[PDB]
Ligand binder design. Sequence first.
Ligand code: NAJ
Ligand code: NAJ
Ligand code: PFB
Ligand code: PFB
Ligand code: ZN
Ligand code: ZN
Ligand code: ZN
Ligand code: ZN
Lengths: 374, 374
Amino acid sequence: STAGKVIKCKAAVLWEEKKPFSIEEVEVAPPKAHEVRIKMVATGICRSDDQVVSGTLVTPLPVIAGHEAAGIVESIGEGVTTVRPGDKVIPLFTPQCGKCRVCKHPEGNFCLKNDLSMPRGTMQDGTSRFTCRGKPIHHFLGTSTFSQYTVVDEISVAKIDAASPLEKVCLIGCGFSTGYGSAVKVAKVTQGSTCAVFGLGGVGLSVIMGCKAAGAARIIGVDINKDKFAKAKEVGATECVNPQDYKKPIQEVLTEMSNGGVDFSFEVIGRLDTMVTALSCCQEAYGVSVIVGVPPDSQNLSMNPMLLLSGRTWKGAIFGGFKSKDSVPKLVADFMAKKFALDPLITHVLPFEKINEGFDLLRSGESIRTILTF
Amino acid sequence: STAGKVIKCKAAVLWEEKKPFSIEEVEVAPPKAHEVRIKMVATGICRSDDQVVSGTLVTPLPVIAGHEAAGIVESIGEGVTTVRPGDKVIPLFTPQCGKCRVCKHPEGNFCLKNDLSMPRGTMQDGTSRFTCRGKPIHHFLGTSTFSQYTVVDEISVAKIDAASPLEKVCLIGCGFSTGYGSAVKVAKVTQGSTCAVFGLGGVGLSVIMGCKAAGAARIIGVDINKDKFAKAKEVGATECVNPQDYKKPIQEVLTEMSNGGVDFSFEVIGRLDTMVTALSCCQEAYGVSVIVGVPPDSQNLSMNPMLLLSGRTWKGAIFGGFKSKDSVPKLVADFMAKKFALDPLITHVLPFEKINEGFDLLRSGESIRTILTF
Ligand SMILES: NC(=O)c1ccc[n+]([C@@H]2O[C@H](COP(=O)([O-])OP(=O)([O-])OC[C@H]3O[C@@H](n4cnc5c(N)[nH+]cnc54)[C@H](O)[C@@H]3O)[C@@H](O)[C@H]2O)c1
Ligand SMILES: NC(=O)c1ccc[n+]([C@@H]2O[C@H](COP(=O)([O-])OP(=O)([O-])OC[C@H]3O[C@@H](n4cnc5c(N)[nH+]cnc54)[C@H](O)[C@@H]3O)[C@@H](O)[C@H]2O)c1
Ligand SMILES: OCc1c(F)c(F)c(F)c(F)c1F
Ligand SMILES: OCc1c(F)c(F)c(F)c(F)c1F
Ligand SMILES: [Zn+2]
Ligand SMILES: [Zn+2]
Ligand SMILES: [Zn+2]
Ligand SMILES: [Zn+2]
């Protein structure tokens, strides 16, 4: 029995920016009221985790990062009603409290209990459940999945199908659901439309999947790494373009290709310049552009508002617009029902001990998703 | 009996930026194929016409400005099918050719034959119908309503009810329709919502009318001229705020007043800083902000894209999102049926010869709309 006791386990601690993860023993406190302790089974490597390493996504350090995962409930605190010991679960980096004005809104998903806007790196109660070498360690987005065991608030966990394969469905905790929902829920891609997707990583591939599911006629993938094109075409891109191949700026190229602008564009990289390019390539009167990539901390973009005055719509979203706790179990059931595929996103499967190697595959351009297994 | 002949008439010619209009004789050529010559009856003074004088809205000079008007067809060119001599008409500063990809789209209204994006100051065939002192004079937006007679392309004119009061319905040619449609069509304001309207001129008052027609529960007007507040409350504002009264930035004030941000905000001024403030004050997860004001030429704004990534929508529109030639006659029929009021917008009436006094009233802050009568 571990229930009610401190667990000593392995975790990947990031002590300061621009350093490898350190794989060492941490102590994980038992869950308090309304908290859940989870034994991790699989976690993905998302570019957002790398941005924490880079320092472009700011969160308190030292930290246990990781937010795209799946595991099994080890124990529950007093008052927990939505999961039990032995349940398969996905932690939710966007919580769903069900009580705030956003949770009550039909189209909101960015719950006011989130730890994204103004990150504290704690549990809801303002404290940490983690220590390492006698020092308190911060949580990340109320998830912290780069650990054999984590503790999450009940509003930050969803119970999923007992038969689901956790080394695949961990992607429903971030990159699949984000990209797919950006297309089908946030943009509301229409049948017969032309879409442009900037960035052909795991999230951008998921946007392509959604555009194809929504019946887009043309899906133009855009990436500076032409090694990404073959998989983008496998999941539905009709054409791929590398901005580096052209004398003209790519917004001009895509406007020409689409006979006057695309219906829907997506920025799935995280750069200010590509957010403005993506907006500009959508048709001036009725185009929609969705920002999915996470921009660099504290930097503003510059843009001409005439792009909007002619009729364009610009919007962004976290987690594909999905209300997290309602939607994650439904997405897992849809995957079990063969409504969408996850294998095209998974290029590498490594033991958790090879986390640094996984990040080097992402940085070098080789991987889409590496799944780490515990 | 003027049909096929040059007409000599008075017009207000703008020879140079930052100068009074010159009321003097012009020559108006007869209409070519698919053109309509109109005897003007009434024209409004819109801030966009003043921005031309200021040089912040660029169009070629010398010019006959004016775009918000109503008149009576004097003659038609070869091939015209949609109006006849003696019909009451409103010139359309946004055309509706009915054939381009925008005109065919269900949402779009910014027809590709517009003269707004890259203004030439000509008719569709690239020539002018106006001479003054033996020199060619530019058109403005394909309308040029500050003249006793104008010539417009058939795609830039709508036939309206024969019993229409032209001294009121001229406002359907720009300010009323723009503001009202920005609320009801572009933003799609919902019953029970909270709205913020930045700028309480004739367009912003029309936005308030639309928000109240849509059932908003709270409509907060924002203006630095507190003399604007009484009329804003008459047409539906529930409260007004003057940014100059507050130590804190008005986005923070409006976020506090709305218990975490408004549902819908509207920028109806034309300044870069209020475009960013208006986006900021809508609720971060589900808010919508609409740009209606016309920004200063060739200037970029700076903003933090995290405002969008949390879930906000930012859009703009021309002419309230209305397909112009379909919509104008319906709006006139609705006015005739008392579905909305125009009198609250009309604060002054002057003869056309007093155009410079009408512009002085707008610049002083004293008027909403002055209507000029020919
Ligand atoms: N909104 C959310 O909820 C959410 C969720 C998941 C990820 N993200 C962000 O989404 C972005 C993509 O994540 P990911 O798919 O894991 O990353 P990724 O696998 O690194 O993919 C990014 C792709 O962009 C390509 N790229 C880089 N620079 C350019 C450029 N200038 N022009 C065109 N292509 C370029 C690059 O080659 C790569 O294939 C990151 O910014 C993440 O932080 C956001
Ligand atoms: N999108 C369109 O189709 C369209 C159509 C009509 C007008 N316009 C533009 O809409 C804008 C408003 O036109 P209008 O109603 O005729 O002008 P207006 O009558 O000048 O009203 C603008 C209001 O803004 C107020 N204002 C000025 N600066 C500020 C400030 N910093 N903060 C708060 N309030 C301030 C000002 O006191 C005035 O009451 C102008 O930019 C027009 O060019 C756009
Ligand atoms: O990849 C998902 C993700 C985000 F979308 C963010 F906006 C963020 F700040 C972050 F830390 C994160 F992990
Ligand atoms: O007031 C309507 C109006 C606009 F919305 C513009 F964008 C524009 F350039 C213009 F000249 C105009 F008159
Ligand atoms: Zn909530
Ligand atoms: Zn992620
Ligand atoms: Zn058209
Ligand atoms: Zn106007």
